[PDB]
């Protein structure tokens, strides 16, 4: 049958209480199989299922480093959205990124995802073509313009059609955001 991998990245700015809390959870099919927390005593990716504990320490070391880098990716874009909406830097705000892929019985890609939400409302999302974007408001339309100009959609498209399919096939044995300034919010 068909399968699905899905990651959820949430960053919540706590003004005066330190740098925003970063959390990343993963879902193979529809089971939470991995999880990262920045407020943990030893912040790293953790296996949330017994069948992921078989992975070597090299694997966990690699995927953790991405999250710690993604944590830096979100703190920067939180500053941007703070200015885009003309909000004060003394309030709490949340930036969310959802991505993953649906596959078929063949094993090939069926649908890729790349969605961004701010304060619980939709912002910008990758279309089914994996080439165009759908913006929610005017501020996101400003974001889409530079993303179509830089071709940020082709960054994720290689992931969704690539290792996202491959990593899903791997976990069934029973990545991050671009750092091009124009490809940012």
């Amino acid at each position, epitope marked *: 049958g068909p399968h699905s991998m899905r990651y959820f990245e949430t960053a919540v700015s706590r003004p005066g209480l330190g740098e925003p809390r970063y959390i990343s959870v993963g879902y193979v099919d529809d089971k939470e199989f991995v999880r990262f927390d920045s407020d943990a005593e030893n912040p790293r990716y953790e296996p949330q299922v017994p069948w992921m504990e078989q992975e070597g320490p090299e694997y966990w*070391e690699r995927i953790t*480093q991405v999250a*710690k*880098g993604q*944590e*830096q990716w979100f703190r920067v874009n939180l500053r941007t959205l703070l200015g885009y909406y003309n909000q004060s830097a003394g309030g709490t705000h949340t930036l969310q990124r959802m991505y993953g892929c649906d596959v078929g019985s063949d094993g090939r890609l069926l649908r890729g995802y790349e969605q961004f939400a701010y304060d619980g409302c939709d912002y910008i999302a990758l279309n089914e073509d994996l080439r165009t974007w759908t913006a929610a408001d005017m501020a996101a339309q400003i974001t889409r313009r*530079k993303w179509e*100009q*830089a*071709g*940020a959609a*082709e*960054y994720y*498209r*290689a992931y969704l059609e690539g290792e996202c399919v491959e990593a899903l096939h791997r976990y069934l044995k029973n*990545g*991050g955001a*671009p*750092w*091009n*300034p*124009a*490809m940012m919010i």
Partner: T-cell receptor
Amino acid sequence: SVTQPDARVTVSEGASLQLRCKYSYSATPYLFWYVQYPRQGLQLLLKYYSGDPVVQGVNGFEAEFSKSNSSFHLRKASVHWSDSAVYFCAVSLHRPALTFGSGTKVIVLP
Amino acid sequence: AAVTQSPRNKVAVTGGKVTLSCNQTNNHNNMYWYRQDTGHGLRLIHYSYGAGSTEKGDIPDGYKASRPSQENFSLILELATPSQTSVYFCASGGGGTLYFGAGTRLSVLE
């Protein structure tokens, strides 16, 4: 991945200089050109991430980006003898850190 | 520049403890440690996102990193090997662009 296929370039003075740099990425990465004059640190010539694919730099150096060719070639119409140095092509995309090419030493012959 | 390394020259010994230090005055959150070897250009060893942060580079084996403050990023060679004989560069990482230091020549002999 980043490749500077020419490790060495020997040119006559006043001629044209073309330093070659290709990158192995599915999308436009943050590109840089650093120069290392003999017994000196690294100095930035130019960079690109969006906008005009042709970027001007100091010392009469211009670099052209080609998404099709996936290259960031560094060109100069008339090279001086003082330009004899080593040029590095850097790249950033997946991480906020720069991955470097193997560098190219240029030797202007007077 | 506003990025300084100490020492600039160090004669080490196989098995000895070597510590490279890099201070900055730019408030750049990111700091980097590279080494240069002919035929390989510039390779990444360790970097940092801020005070207390330590991230592995492309070739971290043999080296240890330390970020005690925003300004200081240190490289620690506990067991010095002749393979660690190279020229080392430090950097500050405000945004995507990088600002290098004058570099440090390290030789490890038997």
